[PDB]
């Protein structure tokens, strides 16, 4: 209750209870004035983009909070403390608070900005808790809470895309006016609070199977089911076709009757990190996996949950099948290989296929005395009955949830970037400086306003997600593989600040370090 009183305190705890962990995080924000308070439409006809890159939409002056990355809540020690002894985690409830609002206003009088504190100006905040809006969150954008808590961040701008016939607007293209929602006027003494409880989303499997899928049998006893071992008796001269069956196997494990199947597949392209073993074309977009939706092509990227490469093929990666997080000194256009972080995905080699590899070979023809048994090569495979797979790993950088789109049907709604597919996700919290106009003229005018006071806000924002942990129940004997720091005389400590204060996350940390048997 201002003005000479703080409207909230700085909470940045991370408490570890028995079966639940409460990760509070508080950041300092700064909201500018976007579009100079206008609902300017955005399309592709101004730039003139490609046929698959046409869009049509609107760009509000509202701004949103997107706490939809894992490092907005977990410090790297808390992430290490989680992923080393937990077979799973899911969020229970969140608790969002927005306090200590300061509405400054800047005067650029004669080339000198004189930022002056304004006290009567307000700030509109609403949480779209009924989902009437486009849900831009979960599209893996920037403008989150920063990783390191001592960073002032800048709030994104809420734009949205709707239906288009190219860069035109079909009569189904919805326009959303966001002052047509009840917001909350916040002076410099008020605060925005709300609470939210997640669904019963499944636990994210933070373990790696210590058994293969085609290695789920007793290596000593042989089976009681037979199979065809041989369609040609070797009588040392020529063909006989005596159809020899025999029991097995203790040793011929590749031919036994299994019981389950590996997961779906959709092949990406095998691309070497070493530049000398790649084709001299371009490539991408020529030999990439892509889909036609309304007559425009889009790369799958990263596709279904598949392993990255085979055993000891660390140089290869799927062309668009991996999360590629950028480092610092990495621009937003044509960065080299060193300044990115390709997340190697290899802990799911047991159940899931390899994204650069076929998912088996079906037969084509009918074998007879006349025609040889030709087999065809399978590349894409929809889900058969009896397939098991395991979803894509999450990361300390990567996204937490996504919105399951409200369609009539959906198959296994896990997001392809990893995370928790939520029907009712955390609602979008949208924020906007109330437009304070400059001096109007003395005679009445019909035209709206071509002059406002240039201003911006700042303040703090607390997000407090309670998670639900799944404690491991292992009877493994030998030690696990756990995420450790590199014990060496190092030049700089990883996941810390530098000589001039730049928080640099050095590597992507997954969550699959423990071993449950399959």
């Amino acid at each position: 209750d201002g003005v000479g009183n703080a409207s909230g305190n700085w909470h940045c705890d991370s408490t570890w209870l028995g079966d639940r962990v409460i990760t509070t995080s508080t950041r300092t924000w700064a909201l500018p004035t976007y579009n100079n308070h206008l609902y300017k439409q955005i399309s592709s006809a101004s730039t003139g983009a490609s046929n698959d890159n046409h869009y049509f939409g609107y760009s509000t002056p509202w701004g949103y909070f997107d706490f939809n990355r894992f490092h907005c809540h977990f410090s790297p020690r808390d992430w290490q403390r989680l992923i080393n002894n937990n077979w799973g985690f899911r969020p229970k409830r969140l608790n969002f608070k927005l306090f200590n609002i300061q509405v400054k206003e800047v005067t650029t009088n004669d080339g000198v900005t004189t930022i002056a504190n304004n006290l009567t100006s307000t700030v509109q905040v609403f949480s779209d808790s009924e989902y009437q809006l486009p849900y831009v969150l979960g599209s893996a954008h920037q403008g989150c809470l920063p990783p390191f808590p001592a960073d002032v961040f800048m709030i994104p701008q809420y734009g949205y895309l709707t239906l288009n016939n190219g860069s035109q607007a079909v009569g189904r293209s919805s326009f959303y006016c966001l002052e047509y929602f009840p917001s909350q006027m916040l002076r410099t003494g008020n605060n925005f609070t709300f609470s939210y409880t997640f669904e019963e989303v499944p636990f994210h499997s933070s373990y790696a199977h210590s058994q293969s899928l085609d290695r789920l049998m007793n290596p000593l006893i042989d089976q009681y089911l037979y199979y065809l071992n041989r369609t040609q008796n070797q009588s040392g001269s020529a063909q006989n076709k005596d159809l020899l069956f025999s029991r097995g196997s203790p040793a011929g494990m590749s031919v036994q009757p299994k019981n389950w199947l590996p997961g779906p597949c959709y092949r990406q392209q095998r691309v070497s990190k070493t530049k000398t073993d790649n084709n001299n074309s371009n490539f991408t977009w020529t030999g990439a996996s892509k889909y036609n939706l309304n007559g425009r092509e889009s790369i799958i990227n990263p596709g279904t949950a598949m392993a990255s490469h085979k055993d000891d093929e660390d140089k290869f990666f799927p062309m668009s099948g991996v999360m590629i997080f950028g480092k610092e000194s990495a621009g937003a256009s044509n960065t080299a290989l060193d300044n990115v972080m390709i997340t190697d995905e290899e802990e799911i080699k047991a159940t899931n296929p390899v994204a650069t590899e076929r998912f088996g070979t079906v037969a084509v023809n009918f074998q007879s005395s006349s025609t040889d048994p030709a087999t065809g090569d399978v590349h894409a495979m929809g889900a058969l009955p009896g397939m098991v797979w395991q979803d894509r790993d999450v990361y300390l950088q990567g996204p937490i949830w996504a919105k399951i789109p409200h369609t009539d049907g959906h198959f296994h709604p896990s997001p392809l970037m990893g995370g928790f597919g939520l029907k009712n996700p955390p609602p979008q919290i949208l924020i906007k400086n109330t437009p304070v106009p400059a001096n109007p003229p003395a005679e009445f005018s019909a035209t709206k306003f071509a002059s406002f006071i240039t201003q911006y806000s700042t303040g703090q924002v607390s997000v407090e997600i309670e998670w639900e942990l799944q404690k491991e129940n292992s009877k493994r004997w030998n030690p696990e593989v756990q995420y450790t720091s590199n014990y060496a005389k190092s030049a700089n400590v990883d996941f810390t600040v530098d000589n001039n204060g730049l928080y640099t996350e050095p590597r992507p940390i997954g969550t699959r370090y423990l071993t449950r048997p399959l």
Binding site: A45, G48, S50, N51, G166
Partner: protein, 91 residues
Amino acid sequence: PPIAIVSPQFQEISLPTTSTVIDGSQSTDDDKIVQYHWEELKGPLREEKISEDTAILKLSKLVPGNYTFSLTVVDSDGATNSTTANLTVNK
């Protein structure tokens, strides 16, 4: 106008492997483009032409020499733009 752009203008294909793709699918517009149209200027005969009225080529059986195709796009309403490609095919 309808502006078109070809994948490179200049390719380098090594023999014996003759199977390339000219990707005229990065050609832009301010609206949709109705069709993409491929043609040919230079080059010898005996090639298996596949889908000249489409976007992404699938070129096969290339004699080492000089091929020269040409992409032409058509806006709604109609506007043409012919940008060509050269196929420096060498052993």
